[PDB]
Amino acid sequence: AFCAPPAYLTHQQKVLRLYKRALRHLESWCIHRDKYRYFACLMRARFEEHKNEKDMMRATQLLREAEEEFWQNQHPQPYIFPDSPGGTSFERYECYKVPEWCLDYWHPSEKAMYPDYFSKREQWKKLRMESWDREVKQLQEETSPDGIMTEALPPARREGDLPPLWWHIVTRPRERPT
């Protein structure tokens, strides 16, 4: 989530994605933890063929065979988490998630109801308006002129400056508010 997906998933990334889907659809199937640990080391007795495969056509063929085995023996209802998508509480607490532009539209009675926090938010907005004119100049010189541009944003190369594109990351609401 906080990092970025690539253009293509590699063979190691697809193999570890199959390992992750296998070791959660196992414990979706084998409910007790004794059966989960015995079948997980049986899954290690299944990974040991894929260790030193050198052709990579046969490794992609074994990847297709293991993926077909995973889709044949997968759980119809997999193991899901409260914080995962498709879950019990996927974006349940969106009643809290009202962002920081909506505090500008408060009445001055409610602004005087919170004295110090709005002064510190004025300090954060002053930090925004004194950081943006050097943040947007940093991206136009660290942007490569070649035809390939990645998704990951550059850090603060200049000392004393903030990283570029920081506000939408730093002012998300909290995932577990209350």
Binding site: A7, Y8, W71, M129, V136, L139, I148, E151, W166
Partner: protein, 125 residues
Amino acid sequence: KYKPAPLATLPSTLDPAEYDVSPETRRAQVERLSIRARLKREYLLQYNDPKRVSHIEDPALIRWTYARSANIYPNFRPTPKNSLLGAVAGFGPLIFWYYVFKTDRDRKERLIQEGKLDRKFNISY
């Protein structure tokens, strides 16, 4: 195996076209990441500009709204398949429910005028 469907599609991890890929397909994926990076950097620059006070004017959403609203009749060509299927879908159930309504009301008017149908407690018609 798992048979595909138009409503239950093949996933991209089980897709056979993900496993036999070419460097031109990989170059297409790199160019798709490059155009998504250009659009994401333009959107994020317009997101985190503090001089902006209005909303984000989404050009592709304006394009989709214009295509669903005011492009269909400028992009009409009258074909016999469109004409026959539109004539069936705009005329056919009117004659069908005409036959249903006229058959049921001819039955009801015939049974009322012959006296077989009785309105026993029917005050508010």
